[PDB]
A paper describes a structure:
The mammalian SLC13 proteins are members of the larger divalent-anion sodium symporter ([name]) family. [name] proteins typically have a molecular weight of 45–65 kDa and form obligate homodimers. Each protomer consists of a scaffold and a transport domain. Structural information, along with cross-linking and computer modeling, indicates that [name] proteins operate in an elevator-type transport mechanism (Reyes et al., 2009; Drew and Boudker, 2016; Garaeva and Slotboom, 2020).
To obtain the structure of a [name] protein in a substrate-free, Na+-bound state, we purified [name] in 100 mM Na+, but in the absence of a substrate, for single-particle cryo-electron microscopy (cryo-EM). In a parallel approach, we used amphipol polymer to preserve the transporter protein, which allowed data collection on particularly thin ice to maximize signal-to-noise. This [name] structure in amphipol, without Fab, was determined to 3.16 Å resolution. The two cryo-EM structures of [name] are in a substrate-free, inward-facing (Ci-Na+) state and provide an opportunity to describe the conformational changes that occur upon substrate release. The Ci-Na+ [name] structures are very similar to each other, with an r.m.s.d of 0.75 Å. Comparison of the previous Ci-Na+-S and amphipol preserved Ci-Na+ [name] structures also revealed prominent changes on the periplasmic surface. The loop connecting HPoutb and TM10a, from Ala395 to Pro400, has moved on the periplasmic surface. The C-terminus of HPoutb also unwinds by one turn (Val392 – Glu394) in the amphipol structure. As a result, the conserved salt bridge between Glu394 with Lys337 of H9b from the scaffold domain breaks, and Phe396 moves away from its contact with H9c. Finally, the side chain of Trp461 is inserted between TM6, TM10a and TM11, packing against another conserved aromatic residue, Phe220.
Author numbering:
A (entry chain C), B (entry chain A): 18 to 462
The structure:
């Protein structure tokens, strides 16, 4: 009937074809066919990506790969509860008005001028997206930006609007690249290659600090805003109070425990996933301090993502179990050896940067990381490099707003020409490809 | 500071005392102390029961019982995803207006009279609570009941209001006793003793069909309503349409697969948790049919419960690992042998029926089932009997509304005297104790 309902049927037909017409052994054919099915379903977004994540275990069981519980156990990877603690921190610092207070105090650092306010705004937006999200952050900042522009004389001056808006969106999508929380794809990568919070900050904080000013400069040089007015702000200059102090303290304590996870856990007994224990402890300290109630943590969090992680991990453990990964590596050895690694990561990064502009970041990541990682390539291991690269690229969505929630949230204003966004995102995607290639070549090797 | 924040500290002090002043071996002392801590936290409801469920794994790890992942894996017991499919069915049959249509078509079965409408109402409320919930069901039926009574002449006639209302509440709480879904405690019991959907219906459907008419009769004989008026109904006589037909069909197919799980799964390969695969398949069929979107399944479901299941299961696996269960059985052997099993289940059932009137059903169940089951008693195994008994009793909340969501949802009307509810619930709780004792003695043995 509907378009998606026919995409699903075509995908079933393709699955059956590959299940009947492949000259590989049964198990590898099964893995490949499941992979194609799941990819066609995640990219097209026919079924809500979470539903496909839930179908992966069923597709694995009905075909005798996994036992039911051994497949559903992947919906409980410690990384998921780490992300849950992150969502709880977000719910706290939104219910207690902490983010508004931070952004406002920053807007005061700039007395009344714009030339410095939008830059501080991008910076704070990224600092938030480090923890909260990519969507809620943009939604929280949008009214602030509009109140800022309230005295811009928005007539034949749409350029400054587009600047102050796309800067916010991209700053969020980029601050999502600094922490394991902030953007799902980072957590998918870590779960696949076993990375810790700080072991991923060492990859994502420099990358973001490099990609954010590059983006602001590219925008300022593509569109030419004036940025010379003043601030006729009239909202309440909110102040600190109990509940925000405690929330900030617990937030800082959680971050301090995360960053220093290794020495602490080494001086405590050597727990396995100390970061996740720290996140659950953040939840416990926020509850014991009466600063946030579970109903908020439940309305706020996005559990579809917490099921998508499990789906991606079940897919990875499938490709690992049925031996499909080693076969794909044996098959791609020739192509990876003929050319170099630099061109390999170049094509990978461009593919992913131009894919998530049509698909969802989390789905593309969950689908691609397992392959390029579980391959265990021959000419060069680089098993974490590519995972981090893809997780970063999947967040580099800068073209049309259907690619990322924040882009649409900011496009809803009604004065962002699609063509300007598209060309700016093209320039930015090329720049990000180049930058990621450079970093992967120099730093991460 | 606050009452709950001091309860927590007293509980920590008690935990430390038992951790320092018990003449049992270290591990059993640890288990007992964790048990006391968690019980004091779940009964008092200081921290949202979900938060205590989340604290159980941390409390188990920081004290070296479990590895982190081996403890968090219990948040993915197939029973949880079964309950998730149940929540999805509820979201479908609420978003597609199926429940309203069913209740209205039933209200038409009674032409315009009341003497038969309230009984059909209790019946349909139970039939719904079989699947949807105990709370949403009462909330969905309340406006219908008020529109029914709109022509009751509710002056010196509060008796019929209380009847048509408490009947609804108790019918929901009892229909929650027929299926694994419908009430969490049933799922906790099954997870503890490995019960299937039908293997638990064989316990819960007769029990509910017996306890519901008993309750209606007790009410009719305590308070004396008239039940003689007509129906001046004026709402829209809704009709069927596409979306409701498909939803009903998928619902019936899911139920037919659940009930006949054994022969099917035996003629298919012998999967381990076929019921859970069937629930996930229900989600998949509801999504593929474009009848419900994940956002509704996420707003609707109660994930706190899906974490509470994991908390209770981690507690059970703790008491099993540290050897506390066998020790408690060795200690209670004398008391269980001196008296009989009949008196044992009698005291158990009364304790639980009068406990959940102050605590939450799910928490009391999650706390008590592990003990009385993992004991593996000496004089008589009865390892599933007591689990089912406690799961049924925990739903038998009939006194003051703070015990159960539905009771408060119906008390909000503003014309339900606390004393009448309390005495009616006392009578009903005694009757339910007697009935459960009788059934456990005759049928389940």
């Amino acid at each position: 009937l509907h378009r998606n309902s026919l995409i699903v049927l075509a995908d079933v037909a393709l699955f059956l074809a590959l299940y009947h017409f492949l000259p590989f052994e049964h198990n590898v054919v099964l893995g490949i066919s499941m992979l194609a099915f799941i990819a066609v379903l995640w990219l097209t977004e026919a079924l809500h990506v979470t539903v496909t994540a839930i179908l992966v275990p069923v597709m694995a069981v009905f075909f005798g790969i996994f036992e039911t519980q051994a497949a559903l156990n992947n919906f409980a990877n410690s990384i998921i509860f780490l992300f849950l603690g992150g969502f709880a921190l977000a719910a706290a610092m939104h219910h207690q008005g902490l983010d508004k207070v931070i952004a406002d105090k920053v807007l005061a650092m700039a007395q009344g001028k714009m030339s410095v306010a939008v830059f501080m705004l991008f910076g704070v937006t990224a600092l938030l997206s480090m923890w909260i999200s990519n969507t809620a952050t943009a939604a929280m900042m949008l009214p602030l930006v509009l109140g800022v522009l309230s005295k811009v004389d928005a007539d034949k001056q749409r350029s400054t609007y587009v600047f102050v808006l796309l800067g916010v969106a991209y700053s969020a999508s980029i601050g999502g690249i600094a922490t394991l929380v902030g953007s799902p794809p980072n957590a998918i990568a870590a779960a696949e290659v076993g990375l810790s919070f700080t072991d991923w900050m060492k990859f994502g904080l420099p990358t973001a600090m490099m990609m954010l000013p590059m983006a602001i400069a590219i925008l300022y040089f593509l569109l030419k805003p004036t940025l010379n007015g003043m601030f006729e702000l009239d909202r309440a200059p909110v102040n600190w109070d109990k509940g925000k102090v405690v929330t900030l303290g617990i937030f800082g304590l959680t971050v301090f425990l995360w960053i220093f996870s290794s020495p602490i856990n080494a001086a405590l007994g050597g727990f396995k996933s100390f970061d996740t224990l720290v996140a659950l402890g953040a939840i416990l300290m926020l509850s014991f301090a009466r600063v946030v109630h579970w109903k908020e943590i439940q309305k706020t969090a996005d559990w579809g993502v917490l099921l998508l992680f499990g789906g991606g991990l079940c897919l990875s453990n499938v490709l690992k179990q049925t031996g499909t990964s080693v076969f794909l590596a044996n098959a791609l050895s020739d192509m990876v050896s003929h050319m170099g690694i630099f061109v390999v990561i170049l094509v990978v990064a461009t593919f992913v940067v131009f894919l998530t502009e049509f698909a969802s970041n989390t789905a593309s990541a969950a689908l691609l990381i397992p392959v390029f990682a579980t391959v265990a390539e021959a000419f060069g291991m680089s098993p974490v490099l590519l995972s981090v690269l893809i997780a970063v690229a999947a967040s580099c969505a800068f073209m049309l707003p259907v690619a990322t929630p924040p882009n649409a949230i900011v496009f809803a204003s009604g004065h962002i020409k699609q063509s300007e966004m598209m060309r700016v995102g093209l320039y930015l995607n090329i720049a990000c490809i180049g930058l990621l290639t450079a970093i992967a070549m120099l730093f991460w090797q």
